[PDB]
Amino acid sequence: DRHSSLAGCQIINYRTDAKQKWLLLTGISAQQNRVVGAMQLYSVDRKVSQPIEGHAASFAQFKMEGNAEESTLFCFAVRGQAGGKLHIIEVGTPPTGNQPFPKKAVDVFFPPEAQNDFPVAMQISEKHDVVFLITKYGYIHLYDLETGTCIYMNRIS
Amino acid sequence: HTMTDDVTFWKWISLNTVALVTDNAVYHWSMEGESQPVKMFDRHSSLAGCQIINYRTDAKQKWLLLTGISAQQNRVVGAMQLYSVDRKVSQPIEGHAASFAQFKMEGNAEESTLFCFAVRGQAGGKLHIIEVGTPPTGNQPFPKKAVDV
Amino acid sequence: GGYVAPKAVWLPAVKAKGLEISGTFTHRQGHIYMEMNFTNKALQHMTDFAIQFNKNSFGVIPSTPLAIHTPLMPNQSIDVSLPLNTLGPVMKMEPLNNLQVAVKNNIDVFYFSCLIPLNVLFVEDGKMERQVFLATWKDIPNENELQFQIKECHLNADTVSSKLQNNNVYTIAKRNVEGQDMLYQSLKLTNGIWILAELRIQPGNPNYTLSLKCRAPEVSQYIYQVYDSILKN
């Protein structure tokens, strides 16, 4: 069943783990002038569920320069009271000989004509380590997945 | 029960216990309570395809014998498996026909555990009687025997 | 008290921007702890400490936030007891007792793994009734029985039984058979899995045979390892 912290929320994604033994439901609200995201993390073997945050994020596999194994990154973007920030991070223990990936943050810019605007979708190219971000207005930005350095931003919609 | 493979023989090794021989294992089943058939060992390949014909254990159920014969090139060749349950190790036939006895040797207080086995081999048929494992403490060992059959 | 391993280095300073973690596990009166020492080998203060585990075979999690309240100054070294429980999400790891960890501070997130010794998962109510022991050993498929060798042991059965008792491995019965001691023993994991054991101690033999029956025989290898460690320590 849908956990009440979600009630009235824009459902925007549904995700499981590989075993389907955990389930994630997400949705966002326009709560008091910000895009607040709600998540439901359901345990299927425990039969217990909890509430959590947010909105445009995806996971990659990236081989860092001198390692043999592909670090599992979790890249997510939000606009908060501090303004819009993208985070890339390792998730879980590095495969054994791997030198850990430094966590990253960068700010995502929203113009003054971008008055409300916030993140909405993310996709990463594995072919070219790049983070594609789409906002609510129809703005795009690409960031370098390893070093979150901005590489372009423009309106396409 | 309902075994998951047909059992190609069985014999009541004791007052309460049922040996099941499947195509590829042997299992004891007790009669007693809710307990179900227990695998004691898998079938040793020299038996494969054989007419199983007997299963036998020692009084302690600490050695198990499976037997079974073939019509190999015009002869009724008998195979045997001799499983050691505490050692967890199993030989093809070193004694095919064999049984164990307790015997009190003439001036001893304690019954020596004999292992009698009979084989025909290239040297022809030989029965062997032997002591198995250390004599009880004051006991004079039993001389190992061998005779031709 | 049961066996506790010496602390070992889990995270070296040079891998973790000057953070060094050493650790062991303990079981104190029905309570599991991850016992660590954190040392700041960096030139910055360290703050904002936090920890999590990946999903794991025995559902091990921290039961509270990590209790580091004050900045860990350069050169400083603190001893941290983190309480654990087994209520957390289960995913079967390889090895079965491996635990993946992430530790954060104000500089970065770092990761490491360590191996949980299974005796901290041996529960207080792990003594089987003799009756139930015989029935359960007989109910468990004989193919599940696994044999192991405790090499170079010279403890008497009494001393084996008292040391194992102190680790919640209970002796149910003892059988003298011709100078051999047989010890029949039960223990119970935090997940409710029972393990039954037959130890065989033979005159002249410096090695004891440990025979383990479990419904989940994959675990048996790890019981043997800590059984061996308890006898040898």
Numbering used by the authors:
A (entry chain Y): 143 to 299
B (entry chain Z): 102 to 250
C (entry chain B): 705 to 937
Task: Please give sentences taken from the publication describing this entry.
Clathrin‐coated pits are formed by the recognition of membrane and cargo by the AP2 complex and the subsequent recruitment of clathrin triskelia. Clathrin cannot recognize membrane or cargo itself and so an adaptor protein binds the membrane, selects the cargo, and associates with clathrin leading to pit formation. The unstructured hinge region contains a clathrin‐box motif (CBM, LLNLD) which binds the N‐terminal domain (NTD) of clathrin heavy chain. The appendage is divided into platform and sandwich subdomain, each with a tyrosine residue previously identified to be important for clathrin binding.
Here, we analysed the cryo‐EM structure of clathrin cages assembled in the presence of β2 hinge‐appendage (β2HA). However in two classes, 15 and 18, distinct density consistent with bound β2HA was observed. In the case of class 15, these densities were in a different location to that shown by our global analysis, on alternate terminal domains within a polyhedral face. Looking at adjacent polyhedral faces, for a given hub region where 3 terminal domains (from separate triskelia) converge, two terminal domains are engaged in an interaction with a single β2‐appendage leaving one terminal domain unoccupied. Interestingly, β2HA density was not present at any of the 4 hubs in the minicoat cage where 3 pentagonal faces join. We extracted and refined the hub regions from each vertex of the minicoat cage particles belonging to Class 15, using localized reconstruction within RELION (Ilca et al, 2015). Using this approach we refined a total of 26,624 minicoat hub regions to a global resolution of 9.6 Å. We also found that separating the hubs according to whether the β2HA density linked terminal domains emerging from two pentagonal faces or from one pentagonal face and one hexagonal face resulted in improved map definition. These two classes were refined separately to global resolutions of ∼10 Å (10.5 Å for P‐P hubs and 10.1 Å for H‐P hubs, Fig EV4B and C), consistent with the reduced number of particles in each subset. As a control, we performed a similar analysis with the α‐appendage domain which does not bind clathrin. These results predict that residue Tyr 815 on the β2‐appendage makes the largest contribution (14 kJ mol−1) with Asp 812, Gln 804 and Lys 759 contributing at or above a 5 kJ mol−1 threshold at that interface. Interestingly, in our model Lys 140, Lys 189 and Asp 187 form salt bridge contacts with Glu 847, Glu 849 and Arg 904, respectively.
